[PDB]
Every structure is written in structure tokens, then in C-alpha cells.
Design a protein around this motif. Structure first.
Motif, PDB file in Angstrom:
ATOM      1  N   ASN A 170      -5.156  -6.531 -13.515  1.00 48.38           N
ATOM      2  CA  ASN A 170      -3.502  -6.376 -12.811  1.00 48.38           C
ATOM      3  C   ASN A 170      -3.723  -5.357 -10.770  1.00 48.38           C
ATOM      4  O   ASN A 170      -3.032  -5.200 -10.736  1.00 48.38           O
ATOM      5  CB  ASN A 170      -3.422  -4.989 -13.340  1.00 48.38           C
ATOM      6  CG  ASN A 170      -2.692  -5.833 -14.949  1.00 48.38           C
ATOM      7  OD1 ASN A 170      -2.740  -7.141 -14.954  1.00 48.38           O
ATOM      8  ND2 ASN A 170      -2.174  -5.293 -15.901  1.00 48.38           N
ATOM      9  N   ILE A 171      -4.849  -4.876 -11.429  1.00 48.14           N
ATOM     10  CA  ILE A 171      -5.452  -3.978 -10.090  1.00 48.14           C
ATOM     11  C   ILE A 171      -5.650  -5.272  -8.483  1.00 48.14           C
ATOM     12  O   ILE A 171      -4.788  -5.281  -7.770  1.00 48.14           O
ATOM     13  CB  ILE A 171      -6.087  -3.353 -10.123  1.00 48.14           C
ATOM     14  CG1 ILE A 171      -6.223  -2.305 -10.239  1.00 48.14           C
ATOM     15  CG2 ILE A 171      -6.639  -2.623  -8.355  1.00 48.14           C
ATOM     16  CD1 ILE A 171      -7.188  -1.162 -10.473  1.00 48.14           C
ATOM     17  N   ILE A 172      -6.736  -6.118  -9.136  1.00 59.63           N
ATOM     18  CA  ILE A 172      -6.444  -7.474  -8.181  1.00 59.63           C
ATOM     19  C   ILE A 172      -5.201  -8.184  -8.072  1.00 59.63           C
ATOM     20  O   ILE A 172      -4.818  -8.821  -7.019  1.00 59.63           O
ATOM     21  CB  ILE A 172      -7.335  -8.143  -8.670  1.00 59.63           C
ATOM     22  CG1 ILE A 172      -8.528  -7.624  -8.561  1.00 59.63           C
ATOM     23  CG2 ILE A 172      -7.331  -9.459  -7.821  1.00 59.63           C
ATOM     24  CD1 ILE A 172      -9.535  -8.450  -9.381  1.00 59.63           C
ATOM     25  N   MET A 173      -4.104  -8.395  -9.446  1.00 48.73           N
ATOM     26  CA  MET A 173      -3.679  -9.221  -9.131  1.00 48.73           C
ATOM     27  C   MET A 173      -2.362  -8.521  -8.109  1.00 48.73           C
ATOM     28  O   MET A 173      -1.270  -9.225  -7.926  1.00 48.73           O
ATOM     29  CB  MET A 173      -2.707  -9.516 -10.292  1.00 48.73           C
ATOM     30  CG  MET A 173      -3.629 -10.777 -11.436  1.00 48.73           C
ATOM     31  SD  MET A 173      -2.450 -11.126 -12.570  1.00 48.73           S
ATOM     32  CE  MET A 173      -2.265 -10.462 -13.370  1.00 48.73           C
ATOM     33  N   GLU A 174      -2.118  -7.289  -8.275  1.00 48.83           N
ATOM     34  CA  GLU A 174      -0.180  -6.331  -7.540  1.00 48.83           C
ATOM     35  C   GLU A 174      -1.520  -6.144  -6.245  1.00 48.83           C
ATOM     36  O   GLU A 174      -0.724  -5.915  -4.845  1.00 48.83           O
ATOM     37  CB  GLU A 174      -0.664  -5.062  -8.255  1.00 48.83           C
ATOM     38  CG  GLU A 174      -1.465  -4.009  -8.036  1.00 48.83           C
ATOM     39  CD  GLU A 174      -1.394  -2.704  -9.360  1.00 48.83           C
ATOM     40  OE1 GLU A 174      -2.124  -1.845  -8.663  1.00 48.83           O
ATOM     41  OE2 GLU A 174      -0.850  -2.533  -9.873  1.00 48.83           O
ATOM     42  N   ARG A 175      -2.514  -5.900  -5.482  1.00 50.25           N
ATOM     43  CA  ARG A 175      -2.955  -5.675  -4.311  1.00 50.25           C
ATOM     44  C   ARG A 175      -3.421  -7.556  -3.491  1.00 50.25           C
ATOM     45  O   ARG A 175      -2.906  -7.376  -2.523  1.00 50.25           O
ATOM     46  CB  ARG A 175      -4.288  -5.228  -4.523  1.00 50.25           C
ATOM     47  CG  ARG A 175      -3.520  -3.453  -4.460  1.00 50.25           C
ATOM     48  CD  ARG A 175      -5.020  -2.500  -5.275  1.00 50.25           C
ATOM     49  NE  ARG A 175      -5.066  -1.434  -4.866  1.00 50.25           N
ATOM     50  CZ  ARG A 175      -5.891  -0.020  -5.261  1.00 50.25           C
ATOM     51  NH1 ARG A 175      -6.356  -0.534  -4.879  1.00 50.25           N
ATOM     52  NH2 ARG A 175      -5.061   1.240  -5.850  1.00 50.25           N
ATOM     53  N   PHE A 176      -3.688  -8.111  -4.650  1.00 54.50           N
ATOM     54  CA  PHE A 176      -4.486  -8.787  -3.610  1.00 54.50           C
ATOM     55  C   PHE A 176      -4.268 -10.708  -3.647  1.00 54.50           C
ATOM     56  O   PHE A 176      -4.139 -11.332  -3.299  1.00 54.50           O
ATOM     57  CB  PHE A 176      -5.908  -9.413  -3.380  1.00 54.50           C
ATOM     58  CG  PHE A 176      -6.602  -7.918  -3.488  1.00 54.50           C
ATOM     59  CD1 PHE A 176      -7.781  -7.382  -5.030  1.00 54.50           C
ATOM     60  CD2 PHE A 176      -7.033  -6.967  -2.465  1.00 54.50           C
ATOM     61  CE1 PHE A 176      -8.461  -6.253  -4.008  1.00 54.50           C
ATOM     62  CE2 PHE A 176      -6.912  -5.935  -2.073  1.00 54.50           C
ATOM     63  CZ  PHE A 176      -7.840  -5.603  -2.960  1.00 54.50           C
TER      64      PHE A 176
END
Length: 267
Positions: A112-118
Motif C-alpha cells: 500500500n505504501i508503494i501504491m500510494e507513493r510511487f
């Protein structure tokens, strides 16, 4: 022949556990393939994370992101099942380590962090799959809501064939350059959650790189892998399954067996 028999065997296997099995295998050395319900949609569950890792490697290739850049999230409430990101929550993690954590440990925080930021969220992740010629793949929701695996729901689904073909393009094709592709292949080889699925259907001497998916609802589980046989060309296998009742638990044994049959159908 060997194909019609294999399909008969698969049909029996889905009757036995009262579910649905979707299979697609590719013998990359000959082009021979085997499919069963290969164009039917099946929930992706967490298996889409193997493609998320690739998308990140593409951004790294295009030099839009650095694989060593630190990703901090010390104040972030981590989603359920974030074994890796919670242990590095105070110090942060490199983009590379987080991406592999997302793949090898199915880490939800990493995902989720990767999908929201990158990657631009579910739309971006889906946009990446379109970029490699996959028109079946679709991700509509985030972890863990995408795991509902409700029968007849087309959200967060794909087909066994599309998954097989995309895995082929990414792991063996030319979407990623030789160096980045080598990293990806090893992240797959390093998966720690698929010992009871596709890895269990092949001799121990064969090398397997895979990414599993377990929705935790309707007995929906799956696995896709690149198999490197001893003295032979890579094989691509995609197994997706669903069950009739919400409380049904998934069956690894049915997946490993479907895998065994599929591999024989393309021998």
C-alpha cells in the motif's frame, strides 16, 4: 491427446473440492501451452504483488526512482500482515527492500505504501499492466479490501492466461533490462509463501520463482511461477482457484496437483 486427459483430470479435481480451477502453463522452449478456464476471471488476491514489484523495477530502470532511496513511514499505521515493514518501521526501508518484501512476504504495508507513493494506486498498477499488453488484469481496490473474492465480482481479477503471459513478459521477456530482470527473477525465487503450491509439484532439483495469493474468503487461493527445470527451458505456470462457500478454506494440495497435471500437459 495428453491435453484432453489433463483437462479431464482438472475437471475431476474441481468437482472433488467443489470449486473452480483456472490453469495456464507455457513451455517457453517450445511454445506449447495448456489452459483450463484460462480466459475466466479469478480473484487476484495478493498475487498481484509480484507484478507490483516489477512495476517498481521498471520505474527504477527508467531512472524515475532509486532502488536505494529510503522510504520512511514511522508514523504510519501498518495494515494487517506487514511482517517486514513493522520491523523496520522506525528506520524506514529502501525502495528495493520494500518492493521485495511486498513480493516475498506479501507485506501489505509495503504494498500500500508503494501504491500510494510511487505507482499511482490501483489505477496506476492497472495502468502498468496495460503498458505490457495485459488487458485482462484489473485492480480496483487496495489491500486488504481486494480480498473479498465475492463470486461474480469482477473487481481485482484477471485470467490465468493473462497472468501467465504477463509473468512471461516480465520474468523472461524484455520489459525489464537484463540487470533489473535478474533482480526480479531472484525476488521471485526468494518467495517464502509458496512451498505448498507450485513448488511442491516439481522435483527438488528444479528452481521455482513464484508469488502466491490467498484471499481468505471463498477458498480463493492461487499461485503463478517461473520454473527452471534441470536441463530444459523455463516453464510458466498459473493456477487460480475459488470455492463455492464464503467459509471454504483454500486448498494448496489442489493447487499443487493442478500444477502437476499442467506441467504434464506441456511436456
Amino acid at each position: 491427446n495428453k491435453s484432453d486427459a489433463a483437462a479431464k483430470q482438472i475437471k475431476k479435481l474441481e468437482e472433488d473440492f467443489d470449486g473452480r480451477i483456472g490453469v495456464f502453463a507455457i513451455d517457453t522452449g517450445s511454445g506449447n501451452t495448456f489452459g483450463y478456464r484460462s480466459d475466466e476471471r479469478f480473484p487476484l488476491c495478493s498475487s498481484f504483488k509480484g507484478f507490483l514489484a516489477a512495476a517498481v523495477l521498471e520505474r527504477v530502470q527508467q531512472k524515475k526512482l532509486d532502488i536505494n532511496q529510503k522510504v520512511k513511514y514511522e508514523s504510519r499505521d501498518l495494515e494487517y500482515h506487514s511482517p517486514i515493514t513493522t520491523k523496520y518501521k522506525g528506520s524506514g526501508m529502501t525502495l528495493g527492500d520494500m518492493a521485495s518484501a511486498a513480493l516475498q512476504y506479501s507485506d501489505n504495508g509495503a504494498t500500500n505504501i508503494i501504491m500510494e507513493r510511487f505507482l499511482g494506486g490501483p489505477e496506476g498498477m492497472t495502468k502498468f499492466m496495460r503498458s505490457i499488453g495485459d488487458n485482462e488484469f484489473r485492480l480496483d481496490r487496495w489491500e486488504l479490501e481486494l480480498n473479498t473474492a465475492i463470486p461474480g465480482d469482477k473487481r481485482d481479477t484477471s485470467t490465468p492466461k493473462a497472468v501467465a503471459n504477463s509473468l512471461n513478459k516480465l520474468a523472461l521477456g524484455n520489459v525489464l533490462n537484463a540487470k533489473v530482470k535478474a533482480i526480479y527473477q531472484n525476488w521471485l525465487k526468494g518467495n517464502t509463501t509458496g512451498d505448498a503450491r507450485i513448488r511442491a509439484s516439481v522435483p527438488a532439483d528444479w528452481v521455482v520463482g513464484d508469488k502466491t495469493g490467498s484471499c481468505g474468503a471463498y477458498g480463493t487461493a492461487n499461485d503463478y511461477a517461473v520454473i527452471w527445470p534441470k536441463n530444459r527451458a523455463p516453464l510458466i505456470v498459473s493456477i487460480y482457484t475459488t470455492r463455492k462457500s464464503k467459509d471454504d478454506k483454500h486448498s494448496d494440495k489442489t493447487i499443487a496437483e493442478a500444477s502437476r497435471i499442467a506441467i504434464q500437459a506441456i511436456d
